[PDB]
Amino acid sequence: SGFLLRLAGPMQSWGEHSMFGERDTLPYPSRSGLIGMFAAAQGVRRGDPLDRYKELKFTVRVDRPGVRLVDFHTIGGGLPKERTVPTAAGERRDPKKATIVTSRSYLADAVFTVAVTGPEADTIADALAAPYWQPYLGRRAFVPDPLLVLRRRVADPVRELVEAVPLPHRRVEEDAATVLVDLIYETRTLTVLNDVPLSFDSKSRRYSTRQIRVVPTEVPATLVAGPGRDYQNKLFTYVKQ
Amino acid sequence: TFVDIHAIQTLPYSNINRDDLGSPKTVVYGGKERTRVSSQSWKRAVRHEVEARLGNVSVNLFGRMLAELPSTEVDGAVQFAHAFTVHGTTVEVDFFTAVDDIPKENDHGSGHMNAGQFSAGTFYRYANVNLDRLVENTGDAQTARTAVAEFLRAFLSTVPSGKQNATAAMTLPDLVHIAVRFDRPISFAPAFETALYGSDGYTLRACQELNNYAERLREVWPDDAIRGYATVENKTDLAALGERYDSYPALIDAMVAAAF
């Protein structure tokens, strides 16, 4: 069982621990987000039991860490006072203060290839191919790369993360081999953060911590693609086989 | 059933969106920085335009009213990608000075010196419409049908209002391609993961590059997707995008016809 999910695209955000106007992303995908991505693909209404998703495992290798950028993002500004965001008391604030100013962060030009291994993950892959709601990378405005699922069915996909999945253009030294790539596994634990989603109900979303261990591993330098456009070519060669 | 629409609309010297400072918004994508027009800004103009022409489908096509309290449907189903330039773009500073009309025994002590940033380029826009949930939530397939058609026309016709009086950036897209897909929505954004080089323009080259990406994706995954595109150029054929149409509203009509 298992399939390869490729998270790529111009921008993707995987925030955790932010609860005000400023938003912040983890430099790598968060299990909560990917689980919600599958739940959205399967029609799981907000508030439905998320234990079906329990028992999955997410090893994620970071091809390009990507640049982290902060996207300004106002809400309601430049509108007449009557048509701005409501207050909790119900009376709209004065128009010179009715604007909301959020500073949301997002990863741009970053690409990870998570190898999801679970009990029903093959039905989940078959659900991403025909989604109930549009899958997106973190914020809904970010739209996933068309090669969202590199392979629908793979026996031992981590074995395919160690090798035989192409890689972006990187420095390849003379007489070099085995270019270093950071794999992320789920003592030797990088960080602890609230990921595993106890409930997605918008009224009270709650989570619990998951330790992450990031192990730099060594994959053959043959894997990295040539400088220009070759990455797309090798990747497409990869999807048909 | 997912109706998605790609446009390659170019914009002259303008500053449609800007940061907390004056400079416009940029994605760093494909290793080359490129200006962008954020999704919410563009969405706001489209939603305002749809609600103005249409006279609660705006809470259905678009998820919820900003100034209304949540009515248990905050999701809009419609997905708006953030528009970004086909090529890499350097931010172009425009130094300006406001002139003082009353003259002292002094000349040119100008009223106000400053410098504002602008940029121009060919943005590759893209959107999605979750048709089935829109029908299940709206109820009547007809209101949904009119709403979907008018939403596509709004996506095409409009341009954001930002520094528009100083730069008349009003423009029509060069290419639109509406693909009624049943498998899943897909954006042709990776066609431009390698920013195109310059000095000969980008409209035509971006048109055939997006044609190459449509051939390849159509090749790996052959689908029952109904497609069609309309261009302001008759010089180049793009067979992978589907049957060509004489115009944009004729195209929108044929694809709205194709969804139902």
Add this chain to the structure above:
Amino acid sequence: TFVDIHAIQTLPYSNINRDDLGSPKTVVYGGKERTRVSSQSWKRAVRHEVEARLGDKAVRTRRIISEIAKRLRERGWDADLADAGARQVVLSVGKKSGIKLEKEKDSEAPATSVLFYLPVPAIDELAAIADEHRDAVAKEAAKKTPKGILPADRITEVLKSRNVSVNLFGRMLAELPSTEVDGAVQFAHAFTVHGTTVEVDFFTAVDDIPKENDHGSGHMNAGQFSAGTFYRYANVNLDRLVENTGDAQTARTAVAEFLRAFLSTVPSGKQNATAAMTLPDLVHIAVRFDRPISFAPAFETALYGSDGYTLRACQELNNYAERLREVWPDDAIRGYATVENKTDLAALGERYDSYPALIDAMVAAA
């Protein structure tokens, strides 16, 4: 409800609009650098010709207090009372204590922090409002920190008065958002159809008295200039201009006068050294009802060169206008006027023999 005007206009070695270092402003558009004339400059030239031709002038000034001071001084006020009364004019209005003022300059009244934009007779009416309350001003002039005694409503009503230029281009005042007027005109940055490298001219100002021994230039430098066929575009939102002036007849004169100013005026940048005065080679007024459309994408692919760009620019704008009318169908009343007779240019609508005939026909059509 949207009148948009396109124009191709060649300028010969002009350098009408300079950046901060003296080089003409450039856009890297279509991948190729193209010199441009900023919109605010040609817009300023348009508003001064419109005010000069329509007779009413508006004044964008940072020094309103000093001007009110000359009017109060000509009304018989003492200089010190005129200065204190004009300070009362700007002190009596706004949310906070008063309109914020720049740091005080010796011997002169302080400039306001923001640029006021109001017609001239309205400034004189502000002087009359400060005049009627002369004794109260005299009493507050004796205090160390005088407060805004004048009525705020009367002053705000004077500051709301609109000139034709205010009706047409709009204004902004951050301390008094009640006075802000939405502009009815979108003025694009005029860029070249073709790619232009910045031409450098090396000049030497000659000393006139002969030196006894070493004769050399008095000063020597190099100023940058450029030439080319600019594309120009502008919109007029008739609904907002009618909303601003109120009556459709003054909006009609404002639109016709604007279009004529758009064709006639030149920014005047080192015109005494280049004489760049020129009429546009082609003009195309469309009266559209759905939305305005600039033909700037038509010239995103820069022209190659070696041959006169005017004929190819007019023909290319023609092909793009044709292709857009086919792609985006509309009932918009079109019309054009051209100098060249080598081509018919069928897509630009009905041809008119002269620019004033074209302006009168399209304004009468709207």
Add this chain to the structure above:
Amino acid sequence: YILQHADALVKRVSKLIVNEPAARAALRRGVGLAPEDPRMLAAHRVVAPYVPVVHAVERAFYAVAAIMAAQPRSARDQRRPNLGVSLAQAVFDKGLNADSTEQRLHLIARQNLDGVHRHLPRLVLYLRSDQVHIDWGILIRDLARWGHTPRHVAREWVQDYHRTLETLTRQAE
């Protein structure tokens, strides 16, 4: 790497100006113009063997050899700094005007490769006219990299200039 061919060109040419007049006079008639221009056909005998194999590198080599031979007789007679370091040295020592030469350097920093060549010979001969030192190999390498750098070299030029002026002023205390 190019700095090597650049130093070989600087040496041979630096000797060539002093010893043989017909060669430098064949070089100076090609200042500030592209090598295809017929006035440059006489300079190929001297410059063509030294260029490797973009026109940007050729324009850098050919042009710096021409500017090098167009020095006034006085200048020709007589860490590795950039042209910006040479600028700051001409401001602090030789007493050039400051507000104008800084303006002229920030005027060069915006051009493209086509424009730098147009502006450079007047500035460099100004600097050279009063015995300001300019290391030509660095200027060559930089002019070759101006073509593919948007501002990556110019920023180095501007930063070094301001920095060297500040240090030269603080050392005078």
Add this chain to the structure above:
Amino acid sequence: SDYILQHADALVKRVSKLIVNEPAARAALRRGVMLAAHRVVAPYVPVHAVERAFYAVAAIMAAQPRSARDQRPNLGVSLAQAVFDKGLNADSTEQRLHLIARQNLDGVHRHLPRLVLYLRSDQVHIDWGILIRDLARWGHTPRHVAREWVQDYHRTLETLTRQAE
């Protein structure tokens, strides 16, 4: 111009075979240095500059001395090797080279046949296809072609001097 080169090479081998095999048609080509050229060279054509760039080279090729007639570098290197190997004077062949580089398209055809036939007289190799294409690119852009010849010439002359020592 890659497509100009293919036709140049096919014309070169066709005309070479015609020169050695038939004297009637070859002499019919040497007179021009004109109907016979129109009935021979015409099929191998893809501007008046490319046609003259074909007919002139086909006539020059047909005017070689039989020593050269029986038996990718351009013409700057062909003159440099002609200097280095045959001992042909460099100071003078340089002047003839710069005098060719100044002419326009009608003059280059006035000074080319004399120098080229002098090269063939010394059995120096001349890649006829490139010389053809260069003459065709000459009506399009003269200065680029002339400079290429001059630079290559002085450059390969110098390299051959390094090989000498």
Add this chain to the structure above:
DNA sequence: GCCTGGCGACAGCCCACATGGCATTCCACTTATCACTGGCTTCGTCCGCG
């Protein structure tokens, strides 16, 4: 039908320069100008409007 060969006679050789020269002074500016606004809380009081 396809492929290959042929269609008066059309010249040959020798030859290709040396030398000399390639400018120099001078001159490189000043002044003035450089925005605002907001994205906290609850409640109470006052003022304006109906």
Add this chain to the structure above:
DNA sequence: CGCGGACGAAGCCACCATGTGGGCTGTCGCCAGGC
């Protein structure tokens, strides 16, 4: 006289570093004879 809108009241905390590139195309000589 009543209601609605706008404004106000705080608590407020500072001697010296930079290297890269490669993908798109077409042509004759004609006629006659022999296999």
